[PDB]
Scaffold this active site. Structure first.
Site, PDB file in Angstrom:
ATOM      1  CG  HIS A   3      39.768  42.187  39.774  1.00 36.48           C
ATOM      2  ND1 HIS A   3      40.894  42.843  39.324  1.00 36.48           N
ATOM      3  CD2 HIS A   3      40.076  41.706  41.000  1.00 36.48           C
ATOM      4  CE1 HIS A   3      41.826  42.795  40.260  1.00 36.48           C
ATOM      5  NE2 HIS A   3      41.353  42.113  41.285  1.00 36.48           N
ATOM      6  CG  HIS A  44      40.340  41.431  44.539  1.00 40.65           C
ATOM      7  ND1 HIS A  44      41.301  40.637  43.945  1.00 40.65           N
ATOM      8  CD2 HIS A  44      39.488  40.586  45.169  1.00 40.65           C
ATOM      9  CE1 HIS A  44      41.045  39.369  44.217  1.00 40.65           C
ATOM     10  NE2 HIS A  44      39.947  39.308  44.951  1.00 40.65           N
ATOM     11  CG  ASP A  57      43.864  45.779  43.732  1.00 45.89           C
ATOM     12  OD1 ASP A  57      42.859  45.085  44.013  1.00 45.89           O
ATOM     13  OD2 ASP A  57      44.818  45.342  43.035  1.00 45.89           O
ATOM     14  CG  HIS A  95      44.002  38.527  39.957  1.00 43.84           C
ATOM     15  ND1 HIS A  95      44.964  38.423  40.940  1.00 43.84           N
ATOM     16  CD2 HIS A  95      43.099  39.432  40.404  1.00 43.84           C
ATOM     17  CE1 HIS A  95      44.644  39.214  41.948  1.00 43.84           C
ATOM     18  NE2 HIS A  95      43.515  39.834  41.648  1.00 43.84           N
ATOM     19  CG  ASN A 141      44.887  37.750  46.787  1.00 45.58           C
ATOM     20  OD1 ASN A 141      44.743  36.615  47.258  1.00 45.58           O
ATOM     21  ND2 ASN A 141      43.869  38.600  46.639  1.00 45.58           N
TER      22      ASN A 141
HETATM   23  C1  LIG Z   1      50.418  41.435  45.274  1.00 44.83           C
HETATM   24  C2  LIG Z   1      49.083  41.301  46.005  1.00 44.83           C
HETATM   25  C3  LIG Z   1      49.252  41.453  47.518  1.00 44.83           C
HETATM   26  N1  LIG Z   1      48.135  42.311  45.533  1.00 44.83           N
HETATM   27  C4  LIG Z   1      47.837  43.419  46.194  1.00 44.83           C
HETATM   28  C5  LIG Z   1      46.901  44.122  45.445  1.00 44.83           C
HETATM   29  N2  LIG Z   1      46.689  43.401  44.363  1.00 44.83           N
HETATM   30  C6  LIG Z   1      47.421  42.304  44.416  1.00 44.83           C
HETATM   31  C7  LIG Z   1      47.401  41.259  43.316  1.00 44.83           C
HETATM   32  O1  LIG Z   1      48.093  40.205  43.384  1.00 44.83           O
HETATM   33  O2  LIG Z   1      46.662  41.477  42.322  1.00 44.83           O
HETATM   34 ZN   LIG Z   2      42.642  41.312  42.658  1.00 45.38          ZN
HETATM   35 ZN   LIG Z   3      45.674  43.473  42.599  1.00 48.28          ZN
END
Ligand SMILES: CC(C)n1ccnc1C(=O)O
Ligand SMILES: [Zn+2]
Ligand SMILES: [Zn+2]
Ligand SMILES: [Zn+2]
Length: 231
Positions: A83, A85, A87, A148, A179
């Site tokens: 996705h 985001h 990360d 998510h 998140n």
């Molecule tokens: C837990 C939170 C802060 N988070 C950080 C990175 N990815 C997430 C997520 O919830 O997917």
């Molecule tokens: Zn995410």
């Molecule tokens: Zn995440």
């Protein structure tokens, strides 16, 4: 045993062999003074490797490539971000500079662009509707519906019965929502049920963050999300 935050200094990456030709990669990142682990996947495809998700940032992703070359020694030729985001796409520029062909759904690419995040080069067709699946080398990519995020994909490795849920699936130790700013709380349980219906034979389930388990992680996630819904 599966590595935890205390075993991984930020900047370092661990590989964990889940099954023959299937690894998770584990990295850490600090966010608001806490440290989070994050998982991705590595899947052998003949004499090449398919990468699922970055290691959350440029420095981690460079360390990821270095650890893969050191431990596995096969080229990462393609990568899929599950996705939009950071990360998951953070480090796409490092992958692209290293010669990796980067991929995401057109939904993910658009959302990454709106967020000002890094944008995978290639667009994955055939994943626009809930329940859509496509084969991508040694894995199946599955769009279960919004959860998510509205674009989140999950990844199944049929040879090894490994299901990588990304951030749509929570580890058992996570008891409250992460998140959810971009989440579809209303659809998330329905999307998880599509995963269960499509991969009932899954033997290993990898959450986006934390310890692997089995298909129990799906209902655990649904329970946490429904409780957050009723908060
Ligand atoms: C837990 C939170 C802060 N988070 C950080 C990175 N990815 C997430 C997520 O919830 O997917
Ligand atoms: Zn995410
Ligand atoms: Zn995440
Ligand atoms: Zn639970």
């Amino acid at each position: 045993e599966y590595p935890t935050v205390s075993e991984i200094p930020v900047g370092e990456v661990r590989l964990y062999q889940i099954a023959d030709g299937v690894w998770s990669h584990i990295a850490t990142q600090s966010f608001d003074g806490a440290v989070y682990p994050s998982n991705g996947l590595i899947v052998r495809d003949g004499d090449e490797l398919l990468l699922i998700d970055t290691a959350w940032g440029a420095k981690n992703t460079a360390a990821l490539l270095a650890e893969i070359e050191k431990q596995i020694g096969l080229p990462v030729t393609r990568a899929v971000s599950t996705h939009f985001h950071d990360d998951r796409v953070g480090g796409v520029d490092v992958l692209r500079a290293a010669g990796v062909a980067t991929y995401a759904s057109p939904s993910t690419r658009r959302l990454a662009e709106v967020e000002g995040n890094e944008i995978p080069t290639h667009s994955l067709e055939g994943l626009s509707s809930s329940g859509d699946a496509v084969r991508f080398g040694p894995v199946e990519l599955f769009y279960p519906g919004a959860a998510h995020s509205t674009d989140n994909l999950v990844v199944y490795v049929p040879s090894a019965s490994v299901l990588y849920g990304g951030c749509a699936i929570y580890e058992l130790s996570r008891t409250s929502a992460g998140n959810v700013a971009d989440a579809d709380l209303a659809e998330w349980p329905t999307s998880i049920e599509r995963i269960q219906q499509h991969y009932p034979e899954a033997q290993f389930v990898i959450p986006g963050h934390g310890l692997p388990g089995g298909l129990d992680l799906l209902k655990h996630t649904t329970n946490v999300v429904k409780a957050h819904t009723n908060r």
